[PDB]
């Protein structure tokens, strides 16, 4: 179990760690989060009390270094940093634990939610979507635009998700116009899976990361990417059976975790109605369709 210490908490802030959250008051004696499960990526995220504008946060994997948070009063945010002096870090953490100034990652033993939301998400892939190679962790916020959004403006602060565009030469083979547009299997299996992602695990990793950035930061381009990656599968007549079964599990846990009161903005009516009721895979997503119908029957 690993630890992310905080130097201090000088401004009142709601802090999230994965799907958990807690409020910290201005100058409250808070010094970090302990008992963080090893083996998964994690995200530590922030919303200031005074300006709910800009949710922001950091994706990290404690196996890759010793990381801590420290507020910067010049840039006005909690920043993640890496401590290279291992003995300093261990000593800092041990003192904060002894004074019980840390919250415990509050995982219930039965609960596989975080695993199920991050099954295919790897830090190495996150670091290619979010380019800042001098850090081992990745910053994301509510405002960051995607490469595709910019094509339709600062390149260094972009989310470099894989561009998917159903009316594009990449998606449409010359002379198979109708075939490829109405059945996207070519684009899914040859262009994207074999060509770009290499395997379905990397495709699912990006889909899962896009969902998490949409949910945790309200990142609109991430929501666009998540739905595009769902639609590309559902609109393909030929999809490996193991991918369809896994997709059903992925989406089931995403829909289960979504805050009920954010569904109006985080869920695209057209995509979901098309995917569950009209598409080639309308009958292949049993678990997802059941949770959607019992939880969000209005959207449908």
């Amino acid at each position: 179990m690993n630890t992310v210490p905080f130097t201090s908490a000088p401004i009142e802030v709601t802090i999230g760690i994965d799907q958990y959250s807690f409020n910290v008051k201005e100058n409250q004696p808070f010094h970090g989060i302990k008992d963080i499960p090893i083996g998964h990526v994690h995200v530590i995220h922030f919303q200031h009390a005074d300006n709910s504008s800009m949710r922001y946060g950091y994706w990290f994997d404690c196996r890759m270094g010793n990381f801590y948070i420290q507020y910067d009063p010049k840039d006005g945010l909690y920043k993640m940093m890496e401590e290279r002096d291992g003995a300093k870090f261990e000593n800092i953490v041990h003192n904060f634990k002894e004074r019980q100034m840390m919250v415990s990652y509050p995982k219930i033993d039965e609960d596989d939610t975080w695993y199920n939301l991050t099954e295919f998400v790897q830090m190495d892939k996150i670091r290619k979507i979010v380019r800042k190679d001098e850090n081992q962790f990745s910053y994301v916020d509510s405002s960051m635009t995607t490469v595709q959004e910019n094509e339709l403006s600062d390149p260094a602060h972009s989310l470099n998700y894989t561009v998917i565009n159903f009316k594009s030469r990449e998606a449409i083979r010359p002379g198979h116009e109708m075939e490829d547009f109405l059945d996207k299997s070519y684009y899914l299996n040859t262009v994207m899976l074999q060509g770009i992602f290499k395997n379905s695990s990397n495709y699912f990793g990006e889909l899962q990361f896009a969902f998490l950035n949409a949910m945790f930061f309200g990142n609109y381009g991430s929501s666009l990417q998540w739905h595009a990656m769902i639609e590309l599968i559902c609109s393909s007549a030929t999809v490996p059976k193991h991918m369809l079964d896994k997709l059903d599990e992925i989406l089931y846990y995403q829909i289960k975790t979504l805050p009920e009161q954010y569904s109006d903005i985080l869920l695209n009516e057209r995509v979901w109605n098309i995917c569950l009721y009209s598409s080639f895979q309308k009958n292949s997503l049993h678990n997802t369709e059941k949770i959607m119908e019992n939880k969000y029957p209005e959207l449908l």
Binding site: K167, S168, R169, I172, E177, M178, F181
Partner: protein, 237 residues
């Protein structure tokens, strides 16, 4: 964006554009089978592709053999339309290719967009106008060449005859849309109006009769009456 009454004069500017109407591409007769079921029999159809400034009608005849063994024909017909329009554009010299293609039915947007991916600078546009181009098969010479075709064929006509020697494109298009609207609302009456006087002929190289300017005014008034006449017979006004 969409073409409507607000931007109607854009049709007659000097940027090459084409209207594409797919109404008459997939045409069927519906009939009973010996077993008392219903079946369709296709008949030849056509794509109606028109330059509204010059009167250039690229009439691609769709022969029934293109449907043989195919499923979902009404969907296929939109994609076949888009394939043939794309092939026409590619066949034209660069300086003759359109800068915009206006589709009369919005269901043609995605098929045409996909087929024209190689031409990103050609705008594919819908229209809010309800244009009467379906009535094209009520022009006898056009219907004749479509029904007689034994294979796919493109036939080039000028739908304005020689009218542009005497009137502007705006006026020619208005006359064409009035004639077609009339033929669409009451084909028999419209055709009676057009041929009643045996002294006015259709030249071999023309589609419509050789009316003088004064006779066109009379004809045009009679077509308006008919469109109003029929509007009463329909709505009881």
């Amino acid at each position: 964006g969409a073409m409507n009454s607000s931007n109607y004069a854009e049709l007659f500017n000097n940027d090459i554009k084409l209207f594409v109407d797919d109404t008459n591409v997939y045409r069927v007769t519906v009939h009973k089978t010996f077993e008392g079921n219903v079946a369709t029999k296709a008949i030849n159809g056509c794509i109606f592709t028109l330059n509204p400034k010059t009167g250039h009608l690229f009439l691609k005849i769709i022969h029934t053999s293109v449907w043989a063994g195919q499923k979902r024909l009404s969907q296929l017909a939109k994609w076949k339309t888009a394939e043939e329009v794309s092939a026409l554009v590619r066949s034209l010299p660069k300086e003759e290719q359109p800068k915009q293609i206006i589709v009369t039915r919005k269901a043609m947007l995605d098929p045409l967009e996909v087929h024209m991916l190689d031409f990103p600078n050609i705008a594919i546009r819908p229209t809010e106008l309800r244009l009467p181009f379906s009535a094209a098969m009520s022009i006898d010479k056009l219907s004749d060449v479509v029904m007689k075709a034994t294979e796919p064929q493109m036939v080039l006509f000028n739908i304005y005859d020689d009218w542009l020697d005497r009137i502007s494109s705006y006026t020619a298009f208005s006359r064409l849309t009035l004639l077609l609207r009339a033929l669409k609302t009451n084909e028999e009456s419209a055709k009676m109006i057009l041929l009643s006087d045996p002294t006015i002929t259709i030249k071999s190289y023309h589609l419509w009769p050789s009316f003088t300017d004064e006779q066109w005014i009379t004809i045009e008034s009679q077509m308006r009456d008919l469109i109003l006449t029929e509007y009463g017979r329909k709505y009881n006004v």
